[PDB]
Design a protein around this nucleic acid. Structure first.
Length: 109
RNA sequence: ACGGAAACCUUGAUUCUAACGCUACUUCUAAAUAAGCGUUA
């Protein structure tokens, strides 16, 4: 059965978040450590690469049953969802992450 | 059988050290617990 399930949620920060972007890329920021933003709305975002990497690192301490010096000698559980470039049968995972844009700018205003 | 696959803008950092809400200034100035004894008898 070919289906696609979509875990949707609202990530509410409970402390200040600093994902951090390049100084000249996310606009020229006067501050020394700017956060990553949307190139048009100039609102902070949570890129899907951030969530994917942090989730893979966290589940790499639980569902690995061993240690890995690279994200290639990983468990089948992590490879099947996030992907492994050197494995033929998991060259792309079953999880697709998305950028998380600001959703409550009205409420903040 | 998508110039594509895999990749945390990440690790370590105390908005901290020093500093008397302090110096000067009389609750003070005059003041008898005292005055009046009528008229009748």
């Amino acid at each position: 059965t070919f289906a696609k399930i979509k875990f949707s949620a609202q990530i509410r920060l409970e402390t200040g978040l600093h994902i951090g972007g390049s100084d000249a890329f996310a606009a020229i920021g006067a501050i020394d450590s700017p956060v990553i933003k949307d190139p048009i709305t100039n609102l902070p975002i949570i890129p899907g690469s951030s969530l994917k990497g942090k989730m893979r690192t966290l589940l790499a301490k639980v569902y690995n049953e061993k240690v890995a010096e690279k994200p290639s000698d990983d468990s089948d559980i992590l490879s099947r969802l996030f992907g492994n470039s050197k494995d033929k049968r998991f060259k792309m995972g079953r999880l697709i992450f998305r950028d998380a844009f600001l959703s409550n700018a009205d409420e903040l205003d």
